[PDB]
Write a protein that binds this ligand. Structure first.
Ligand SMILES: Nc1nc2c(ncn2[C@@H]2O[C@H](COP(=O)(O)OP(=O)(O)O)[C@@H](O)[C@H]2O)c(=O)[nH]1
Ligand SMILES: C/C=C(\C)CC/C=C(\C)CC/C=C(\C)CCC=C(C)C
Ligand SMILES: [Mg+2]
Lengths: 186, 189
């Protein structure tokens, strides 16, 4: 429908907290810190344990509690396909995203999922999903985003352009791509 | 029972370790006190139901600024601690901890805790402090700081005399068990 107004997703509607990202320190530098302090070691062990970049997003899964079957995206390799792939999602449904990743060498500080929504070259939203900090390990990690509700659409029932990326406090660009989502009725 | 994970942050020497030890053992440790109290879950029965409270003590040193946050994922309640007889650590709640905890734990209840309640009256304390143009932290002050970082409750306690130390963890659990209804944020458009 006519969308001349939508260029104004209200104010940012933000509440960013002034947080200074942590200086860059390596796990080795971390364990060689206070090595005479037993408790610290138990503390570091309780938290870390015992051709690839540091982080690798395996896939996003859309946890929808209405229509059977999963809903995933294989964030591995060929991503151009997403630009011609079409995705639908019923109106105002209760959903949540399941981000699954894997950390390899160092620590990921403040990893986050940023999702810009577009409707004719008009960013009508910027949502940030704080995933968190994690240590390296073989077992992948899985993080569920808070419960949510898709928009209504006697108005916003058109197709949209979606640009996503995974970054963190170190402003590292772990992943990024664009896809197309559409809101139907059934 | 049900598992509620609790993390305890705050400046060094505020009393986060002695707080967790005086709570789990029912006795104040004096001389020997580890930098970090080992992770421990305690069985408590608040409001007629058992709970598996997982207590985490961290290292407030800025030296571990990147390591510490690895404990925030999966947390249900965070306690920002500060000494009542340390104006420094107080100012440090809005400057360091609140921004840290909130940024790593959005939509996670926060409890502000003023430790060392037993030192608020002590003569000696109000002197070496009283000679630096500094006075002890008042209750209204902490209450005000709470209202400011948006904490669900303000509590004061002392590990030494174990005063009010019981309510701090009852309130933390009460904050996770049955809190107010979220506003259903991010409700697109
Ligand atoms: N009077 C008094 N001293 C305390 C209390 N809690 C901790 N202390 C003392 O303060 C110092 C630092 O406390 P600690 O628990 O190690 O601080 P942390 O760095 O936050 O872990 C130690 O010498 C403790 O005996 C308290 O409630 N009252
Ligand atoms: C101002 C916002 C309007 C007009 C609503 C547009 C609809 C949006 C932005 C829906 C969001 C959809 C998702 C986050 C889908 C998640 C799916 C995967 C991660 C596969
Ligand atoms: Mg400690």
């Amino acid at each position: 429908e006519q969308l001349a107004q939508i260029a104004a997703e209200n104010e940012e509607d933000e509440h960013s907290v002034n947080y200074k990202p942590p200086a860059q320190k390596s796990i080795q530098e971390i364990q060689e810190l206070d090595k005479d302090d037993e408790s610290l070691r138990k503390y570091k062990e309780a938290l870390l344990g015992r051709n690839v970049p540091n982080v690798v997003v395996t896939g996003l899964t859309l946890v929808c509690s209405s229509a059977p079957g999963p809903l995933e995206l294989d964030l591995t390799g060929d991503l151009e396909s997403f630009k011609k792939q079409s995705f639908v999602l019923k109106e105002g449904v209760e959903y949540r995203i399941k981000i699954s990743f894997r950390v390899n060498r160092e620590i990921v500080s403040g990893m986050k999922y940023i999702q810009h929504t577009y409707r004719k070259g008009v960013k009508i939203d910027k949502t940030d999903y704080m995933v968190g900090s994690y240590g390296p390990r073989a077992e992948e990690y899985e993080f569920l985003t808070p419960v949510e509700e898709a928009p209504k659409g006697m108005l916003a029932r058109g197709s949209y352009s979606i640009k996503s990326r995974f970054t963190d406090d170190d402003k590292t660009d772990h992943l990024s791509w664009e896809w197309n989502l559409t809101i139907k009725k059934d | 029972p049900q598992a509620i994970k609790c993390v305890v942050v705050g400046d060094g020497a505020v009393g986060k370790t002695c707080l967790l030890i005086s709570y789990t053992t029912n006795a104040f440790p004096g001389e020997y006190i580890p930098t970090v109290f080992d992770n421990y879950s305690a069985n408590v029965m608040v409001d007629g139901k058992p709970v598996n409270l997982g207590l985490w003590d961290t290292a407030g040193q800025e030296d571990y600024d990147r390591l510490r946050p690895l404990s925030y994922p999966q947390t249900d309640v965070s306690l920002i601690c500060f000494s009542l007889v340390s104006p420094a650590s107080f100012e440090n709640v809005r400057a360091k901890w609140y921004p840290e905890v909130r940024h790593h734990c959005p939509n996670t209840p926060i409890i502000l805790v003023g430790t060392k309640l037993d030192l608020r009256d002590d003569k000696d304390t109000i002197e070496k402090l009283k000679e630096k143009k500094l006075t002890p932290i008042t209750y209204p002050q902490g209450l005000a700081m709470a209202k400011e970082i948006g904490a669900v409750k303000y509590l004061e306690c002392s590990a030494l005399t174990q005063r009010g130390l019981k309510t701090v963890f009852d309130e933390a659990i009460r904050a996770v068990l049955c809190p107010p209804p979220v506003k259903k944020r991010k409700r697109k458009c």
